[PDB]
Nucleic acid binder design. Structure first.
Length: 109
DNA sequence: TGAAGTGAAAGT
DNA sequence: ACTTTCACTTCA
């Protein structure tokens, strides 16, 4: 699975709290984006999606690899921003709240 | 304060 | 088809 299909599956699964569809037609989604220095940040919940992508691509096995959620986060961020399959919609990305999240559009084709 | 984050560019 | 690295900035 490429990143677009993989993330579609992760959003649909509802297994990551706050990683969910922004609108009814499922063209837009929210991705939780909590700053890791915050009190209430928990890696097991807040870094789990980034972790999953790293493991899905073989870029982290618990054992060979230092577990660095900051490098998991940047990897997904750079992947999202570089691919023509996605577009960040900063207008509805709400980063000032308690469960802050970014919004992305998924481009079809 | 030092950790965590970033876009841009260089990278495989 | 994404990934890694840089200087520099932003965060709590």
């Amino acid at each position: 699975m490429r990143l677009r299909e993989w993330l579609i599956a992760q959003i649909d699964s509802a297994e990551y709290p706050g990683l969910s569809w922004e609108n009814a037609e499922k063209s837009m989604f929210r991705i939780p984006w909590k700053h890791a220095a915050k009190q209430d940040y928990r890696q097991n919940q807040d870094a789990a999606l980034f972790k999953a992508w790293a493991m899905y691509k073989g870029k982290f096995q618990e054992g060979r690899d230092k577990a660095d959620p900051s490098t998991w986060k940047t990897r997904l961020r750079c992947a999202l921003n570089k691919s023509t399959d996605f577009q960040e919609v900063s207008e509805r990305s709400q980063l000032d709240i308690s469960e802050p999240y970014k919004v992305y559009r998924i481009l079809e084709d």
